[PDB]
Write a protein that binds this ligand. Structure first.
Ligand SMILES: [Zn+2]
Length: 354
């Protein structure tokens, strides 16, 4: 019988989505499933869905998370896929993830009813050899890759260890926190660093480039991350909206970036055949990669003006004389385009388009 783990007693009802993240449990031809994976992974995926949804709600989007196909209460409809080759054919290195994704493309072409969006989370059991095992999982792809994400499973991959000061709890923050961040990449998120103010109130940005924090110390999603998720296919509540087709078409004009005291003033105009959902601004140190501090403003029109004032004291962690400001325009179909501008703190020069 299904029971709800204590970590899921506090949970919000989520909006029904038009597209769902596919969950594939990917087994080499010689690979057995890790026991109880249906329960363990359902619990972990539903808790992760709550994290994303509560953060979207906190940022004003309502109770919107990535969609999941639910088989029964507390149980995600996980596709168990038995692969054509042994697990050694799909390693972390040397294109293992690409080979697995290609094979799943064929599976979904043969069984299109099982595909619910362009986004897939592929989970593979750990290898068990002289390097990896239940106490040191690994061997398998573990990264975002395009719209897909690869993560791993092992016996103690179980929400009951969340936040426990134990060997298994530490393992969970590494591999579940890892899954949370890598899934972010699969959901179109780049890296970004919290602002000074957000760091003090909410902790560490999920998509920061440092060590995984999820489940161990306060972790949150930035406004810029949530603006991208707003335009992510598996967060859609609008069946008529198509995602990722074509090219990102945004005309940006009369761009001006000026510096006055501790304020950075960014302005210009935009025009697109699509609704432009939002502007994200990233301020980043070289090399051109360390985490950029991000900011976001809603737009919501096909044409208009944009204006953002950024306080330099929010730029926590930046320490280079050279810095780059990137303007990212996010479109309703989930594509985006960026423009970049480079400056030096010891020789600040206001920018204006020619
Ligand atoms: Zn990353």
């Amino acid at each position: 019988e299904v029971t709800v783990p204590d970590a899921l007693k506090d949970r919000i009802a989520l909006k029904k989505t038009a597209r769902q993240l596919n969950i594939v449990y990917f087994l080499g031809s010689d690979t057995e499933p890790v026991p109880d994976y249906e329960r363990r992974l359902s619990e972990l995926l539903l808790y992760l869905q709550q994290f994303y949804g509560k953060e979207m709600q906190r940022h004003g989007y309502g109770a919107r998370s990535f969609g999941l196909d639910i088989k029964s209460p507390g149980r995600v409809n996980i596709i168990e896929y038995k692969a054509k080759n042994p697990a050694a054919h799909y390693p972390y290195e040397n294109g293992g993830g690409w080979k697995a994704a290609q094979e799943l493309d064929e599976f979904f072409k043969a069984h299109p009813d099982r595909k619910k969006s362009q986004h897939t989370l592929i989970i593979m059991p750990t290898w068990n050899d002289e390097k990896n095992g239940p106490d040191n999982p690994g061997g398998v792809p573990f990264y975002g890759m395009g719209r897909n994400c690869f993560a791993l499973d092992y016996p103690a991959f179980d929400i009951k260890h969340l936040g426990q000061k134990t060997r298994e709890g530490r393992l969970l923050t590494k591999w579940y926190g890892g899954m949370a961040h890598e899934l972010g990449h699969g959901l179109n998120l780049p890296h970004n660093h919290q602002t000074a103010s957000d760091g003090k109130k909410y902790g560490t940005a999920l998509m920061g480039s440092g060590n995984y924090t999820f489940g161990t110390s306060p972790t949150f999603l930035t406004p810029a991350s949530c603006a991208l998720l707003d335009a992510c296919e598996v967060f859609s509540v609008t069946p008529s909206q198509q995602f990722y087709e074509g090219k990102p078409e945004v005309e940006v004009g009369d761009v001006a970036i000026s510096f006055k005291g501790d304020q950075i003033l960014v302005s210009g105009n935009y025009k697109s055949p699509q609704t432009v959902k939002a502007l994200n601004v990233y301020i980043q140190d070289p090399p051109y990669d360390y985490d950029a501090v991000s900011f976001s403003r809603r737009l919501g029109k096909k044409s208009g003006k944009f204006s953002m004032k950024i306080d330099k004291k929010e730029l926590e962690g930046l320490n280079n004389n050279e810095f780059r400001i990137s303007l990212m325009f996010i479109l309703a179909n989930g594509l985006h385009m960026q423009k970049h501008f480079t400056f030096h703190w010891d020789a600040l020069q206001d920018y204006r388009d020619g």
